Design a binder for this molecule. Sequence first.
Ligand SMILES: NC(=O)c1ccc[n+]([C@@H]2O[C@H](COP(=O)([O-])OP(=O)(O)OC[C@H]3O[C@@H](n4cnc5c(N)ncnc54)[C@H](O)[C@@H]3O)[C@@H](O)[C@H]2O)c1
Ligand SMILES: NC(=O)c1ccc[n+]([C@@H]2O[C@H](COP(=O)([O-])OP(=O)(O)OC[C@H]3O[C@@H](n4cnc5c(N)ncnc54)[C@H](O)[C@@H]3O)[C@@H](O)[C@H]2O)c1
Ligand SMILES: NC(=O)c1ccc[n+]([C@@H]2O[C@H](COP(=O)([O-])OP(=O)(O)OC[C@H]3O[C@@H](n4cnc5c(N)ncnc54)[C@H](O)[C@@H]3O)[C@@H](O)[C@H]2O)c1
Ligand SMILES: NC(=O)c1ccc[n+]([C@@H]2O[C@H](COP(=O)([O-])OP(=O)(O)OC[C@H]3O[C@@H](n4cnc5c(N)ncnc54)[C@H](O)[C@@H]3O)[C@@H](O)[C@H]2O)c1
Lengths: 258, 258, 258, 258
Amino acid sequence: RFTDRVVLITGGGSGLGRATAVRLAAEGAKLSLVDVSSEGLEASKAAVLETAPDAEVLTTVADVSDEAQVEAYVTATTERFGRIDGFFNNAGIEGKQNPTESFTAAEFDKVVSINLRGVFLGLEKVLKIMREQGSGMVVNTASVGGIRGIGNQSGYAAAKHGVVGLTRNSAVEYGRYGIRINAIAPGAIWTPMVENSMKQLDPENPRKAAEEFIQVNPSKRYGEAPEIAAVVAFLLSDDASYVNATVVPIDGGQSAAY
Amino acid sequence: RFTDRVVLITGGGSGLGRATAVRLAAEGAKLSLVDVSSEGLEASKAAVLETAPDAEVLTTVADVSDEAQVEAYVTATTERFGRIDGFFNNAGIEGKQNPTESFTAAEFDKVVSINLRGVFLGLEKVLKIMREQGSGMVVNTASVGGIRGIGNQSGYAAAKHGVVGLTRNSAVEYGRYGIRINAIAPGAIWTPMVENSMKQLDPENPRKAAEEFIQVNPSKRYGEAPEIAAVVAFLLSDDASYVNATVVPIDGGQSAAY
Amino acid sequence: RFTDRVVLITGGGSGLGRATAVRLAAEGAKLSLVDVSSEGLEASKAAVLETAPDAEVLTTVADVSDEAQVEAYVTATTERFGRIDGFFNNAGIEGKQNPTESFTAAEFDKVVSINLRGVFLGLEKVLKIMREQGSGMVVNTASVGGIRGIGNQSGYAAAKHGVVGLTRNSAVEYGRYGIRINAIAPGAIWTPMVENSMKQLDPENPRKAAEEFIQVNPSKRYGEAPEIAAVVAFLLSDDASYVNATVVPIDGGQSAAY
Amino acid sequence: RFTDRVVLITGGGSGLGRATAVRLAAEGAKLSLVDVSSEGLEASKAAVLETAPDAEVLTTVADVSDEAQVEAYVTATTERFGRIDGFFNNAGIEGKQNPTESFTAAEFDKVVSINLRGVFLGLEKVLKIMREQGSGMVVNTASVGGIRGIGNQSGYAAAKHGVVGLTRNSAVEYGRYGIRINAIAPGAIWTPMVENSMKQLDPENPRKAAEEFIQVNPSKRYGEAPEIAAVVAFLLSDDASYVNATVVPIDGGQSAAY
Ligand SMILES: NC(=O)c1ccc[n+]([C@@H]2O[C@H](COP(=O)([O-])OP(=O)(O)OC[C@H]3O[C@@H](n4cnc5c(N)ncnc54)[C@H](O)[C@@H]3O)[C@@H](O)[C@H]2O)c1
Ligand SMILES: NC(=O)c1ccc[n+]([C@@H]2O[C@H](COP(=O)([O-])OP(=O)(O)OC[C@H]3O[C@@H](n4cnc5c(N)ncnc54)[C@H](O)[C@@H]3O)[C@@H](O)[C@H]2O)c1
Ligand SMILES: NC(=O)c1ccc[n+]([C@@H]2O[C@H](COP(=O)([O-])OP(=O)(O)OC[C@H]3O[C@@H](n4cnc5c(N)ncnc54)[C@H](O)[C@@H]3O)[C@@H](O)[C@H]2O)c1
Ligand SMILES: NC(=O)c1ccc[n+]([C@@H]2O[C@H](COP(=O)([O-])OP(=O)(O)OC[C@H]3O[C@@H](n4cnc5c(N)ncnc54)[C@H](O)[C@@H]3O)[C@@H](O)[C@H]2O)c1
C-alpha cells in the first residue's frame, strides 16, 4: 500500500517509530527518519534494510521542541524525496513520575515542550506541504493517558490529551483537502519507554511492577511494537481514506473497560 | 491477510456487507454470506466472483431477529467450512423517522429486534465457536448514531448505542482468549440505506436533502462502501491483534467536530 | 428549587428512586412515584413524609415494560397534579450474570424490555406533555455499564448503552422547547440492586466480592444513594438550564481512570 | 450549601468567574478572587456585595502563568481565611484564530502558558493544601473545544484538552482523600471572551457571526453566565460528593449531537 510513497517519522530511532519504519518499508515506502539520537537512527535504518534491502532511508538528527530544527527535518525530507505522503508525528518522553503537588513546573514544562509543542510544530510545517499537494495522511501519537487518567503523570496526561486536541482541531480544518489526521492511543506496549516506566514505578523490582500492571488488562498481555506499526500503517494508507479526527486505542481493550 | 480464512458476514446481500465481501475475497478469504434477501445474496456472490474467480462463497437466507435462523446460518457455516475466523455482525435497518413522541412502540421494537437482538444472537452463537478455536476477530456494525444523537431516530439510536455496549461488554469477556471484538461507526456512506434515509428526510427532494446533510462534514463529501470495507478488513485481520473493545468512526471527522 | 414543582419517578419504591424522592420533597416538590412493588411505594412515601410532613405524594403500581401501564401512570400523574415538571426515568433490573455465549435470549429480552423499552415508552408519553407545556426536565438512569464494559452483563450493557442513545437522540429533538434531557451513569452505589449483584458475583462470600470490587476505585469507597439523589436534583432543577444530552458519571472517578 | 466555606476563583474579575462568585456568595461562601485586572476585581467584588452585603471577599492581582504569583495568591488566601474548601481554576484566554499552518509558535506558547500551565500550577499548590485538610472540591474550566474540534484554534484546543487531562490524572490521584476534581466544558455562553471570539470570526459583522454560530445548537440559543455558575456551584458543593474526574458539558447539547 506504500509503493513509492514518502513517509516521515519522528522518534524514528527507537520503539514504535522503528517498528513502524520496518512495517512501512516492507510495504514499499520511502522513509525519512528523525530523532535526537544518531545512534538510534543508525540502528533503525539497519533494521529497515534487513527487511527491505532496496529501501530508500534518510536519517536526520533534530530536536522536535525546537522550531528551527523542525523546519530543518522537513526541508531535509522534501529536498531528498520531493514530497511527504505520510507523517507519523511520534516523538515523545514520559517524564518523572510524581503526584500533582510534587510534579514540579520544570518537569511539566519539559514534557509539554517535547510531547505537545513538538507535535504542534510538526503539524504546522507538514500540513502546509500536504495542503499544497492536495493529499496526505497524518498520525499523531497520543496514549491511553491522552484519553484517560493514569495517575502520577501530570505532564504526560496534559501533553497527550493536548495531542488529541491538536488531532481533532487540525482534522476539522484540513479534511476538506482530502488530508486525514488521526491519533493512536497505545496502552501497555513493551517498548523502551514502557520498560523505563516500570523502572520508575518500582526501582527495586521493575519485573514485579510490569507483571502487576498488566493483570487487569482484558487481553491479559502486553502488546508488541509491530502491533502498533500495523495500525499506523493502516491509518497512513488509502484504507483510511474516510477515517478522520479519530483516536484509535491499541490497548487490548482496557480504556473501554470499567 | 485472509488467505484461507473463513469470514461470516450478515447483511451480506447489499451495501457494506457486499463491499466487505469483495474486499476480503480479494485478500483470499473464504466467505459465508447471510441475508434475508436471496436475490441480494446472489448479486453479492456474483460481485465477489468477478473480483476473485476462485473464491469459495456460501450463501444462506436467514432473518437475524429469529434465534432459530441465527443458529441455522452459524451451523451452515461450520458444516461447510469447519471454522469461523472472522465475523462481520452487520445486518440492520434504519426504521421510520419520527420524533420520540410519535416514533411508536411497534417501530421501536422492530428496529431493536433486528439491529440489537440480531447482533446479540450472532455474538452468543459465534463467540462460543471462537473461544473453542482459541482465536477469532469480530466487527459489529454500529453507527455515528451509536455514539451521538442524530434526531428523529429513537429506535436506531437506542439499538446502535446498544451494539456499542455489546461490543464493549463482550470484548472484556473474550479478550483473554486472543479474540478481538470491535465496532465500526459509519457516518454518511452512500449505500441503499442512506439513499432511502434521504428519501425519508425529504420525499419531495431527496437529492437536496443529501446535499444539505453533508455540507457540515469536515471532509465535505459522502464516504463510499469500499472505504468502510477497508477498515473492516483491517479490524478482521492480524493487523488488529491488539485492538479491542474499540469503536472506530468512519465519518470524515464529523463525530469529533463541535 | 422545587417548590410546587411536580416530579414523576419510576422505580420510586426503592434505592435511587426513593432517595431522590426524599431529596426532592425536602426541596418542596410534589411527587408521583411509580413501581411494580406496592410495599416499596408505601415505604418510600413514609420516608418522604418523615422529611417533609406536608408533602403531596401519589403512588401508582405499574410495570414499565407494559405500554398500557406506562400510559396509566402518566395519566394518573396528570389527573392528580395537572402537569409534569420533572421526570426521573429510573426503573430497572440487573439481569442474571453470564458470559455472552451463556447469557440466553430470554434473559437478554427481559432486561431490554424493562431497562430500555421502559425508558423509551416513558419518554414517548412524557415528552409530548412537556412539549405542550413548553418546559420540562428529564433524567434517564443509565449506568457506568452504559458507557463502559463491565463484563458478564450482555443484557444490561446493551440496554444501558441504549438509554444513553435515547438520551442523546431525544435531547437533540426537544432542546428547542427549553426541555432538557440528560442521563446519570451511577457506579458502585450501595442499593438493593448492587447488593444482589455482589450476591451473584460470589454467593458464598458476597461481602468479599464487594470488598474486592471497590479496591480499584479512585475514591476507595462505595457511593451512597443520597449522593445520587443530589445529582438528580441538580439535573431536574433550573440550575441545569443549559445542560442537555449529557451523561454524568457518579462513580468516584473510575470510568475516567485507565 | 456554602455557609462559611472558602472558595478561590481565578479569572474572577469577569465573565464566568464573576458570575460564579455572585452565585456562591448567595449561598453563603467566603471568596478569594484572583485576576490580572484590578478594575475587573473591583467590579466583581462590588457585584458580589450587591447580592450578599455580608460576604467576605478578598481580591488579589496575579498572572497565573507565573509560578511566583500563583504561590502568592494561594498564600494570600490562606493567610486571610486559613483554608481553601473550593477552587474554580478558571482563568483563560482564547488566542488569535488561524488554521494550524498559520497559528504560529508564539501564539501557541501564549495560550498554553495561561490556559494549561496556569491550571497545572494552581492544582499543584492548592491540592497540597486540600490533602492536608482531608477535603476539598475543584472545578477546572475546560471547554467544548477541550473535548471536540472547533477549528482554527490549535492553541486553545491543545490547552483545553490538556486541562481535561490534568482533571482526570489529578482526580485519580486525590480521590482517596475525599477530594473531588472535575471539569466543565462550556459551549456558546455569552461572556466577554465569546463576544470577542465572534469579532475575530467576522470583524465586519460580529452580530451575523454570532447568530450564524448558534443556529445549529439543539437549544437554539446562547447560554448565559449564571447558567454556568449554577453548575459550578453544584460541582463545588457536597452535592457532588461522589462525582469525580468527569467533564460536564454545558452547551445546550451540541457536543452530543452528530
Ligand atoms: N502507554 C503509553 O502511554 C505509551 C506506550 C508506548 C509508546 N507511547 C508513545 O509512543 C511514542 C514513542 O514511544 P516509544 O515507546 O517508541 O519510546 P522510545 O523511547 O523507544 O522512542 C522514542 C524516541 O523518540 C526520541 N525522542 C525523544 N525526545 C525527542 C526530541 N526532543 N526530538 C526528537 N526525538 C526525540 C527518542 O530518542 C526515541 O528514539 C511516544 O510519543 C510515547 O509517548 C505511549
Ligand atoms: N450513518 C449510518 O448510520 C450508517 C450508514 C451506512 C450503514 N450503516 C449500518 O451498516 C449496516 C449495513 O447497512 P447498509 O448501508 O449496507 O444497508 P443495506 O440496506 O444496503 O444492506 C443491509 C442488508 O441487511 C439485510 N437485512 C436487513 N434486515 C435483516 C434481517 N432481519 N436479517 C438478515 N438480513 C437483514 C438487508 O436485506 C440488506 O441486504 C447496517 O447495520 C447499517 O445500520 C449505518
Ligand atoms: N452500577 C450500576 O450499574 C448501577 C448502581 C445503582 C443503580 N443503577 C441503576 O439505577 C436505577 C435504580 O436502581 P436501584 O439501585 O435503586 O435498584 P433497586 O432495585 O433498589 O430499585 C429499582 C426499583 O425499580 C423497580 N422496578 C424494577 N422493574 C420494574 C418494572 N418492570 N416496572 C416498574 N418498576 C420496576 C423495582 O421494584 C425497584 O423498586 C436502575 O435503573 C439501575 O439499573 C445502576
Ligand atoms: N466555548 C468556550 O470555549 C468557552 C466559553 C466561555 C468561557 N470559556 C472558558 O471559561 C473561562 C472564563 O472565560 P470568560 O468567558 O469568563 O472570559 P473573560 O475574558 O470574561 O474572563 C476571563 C478572566 O480571566 C482573566 N485572565 C486572563 N489571563 C489571565 C492570566 N494570565 N492571569 C490571571 N487572570 C487572567 C481575565 O482578565 C478575565 O478577567 C476561560 O477559561 C474560558 O476559556 C470557554
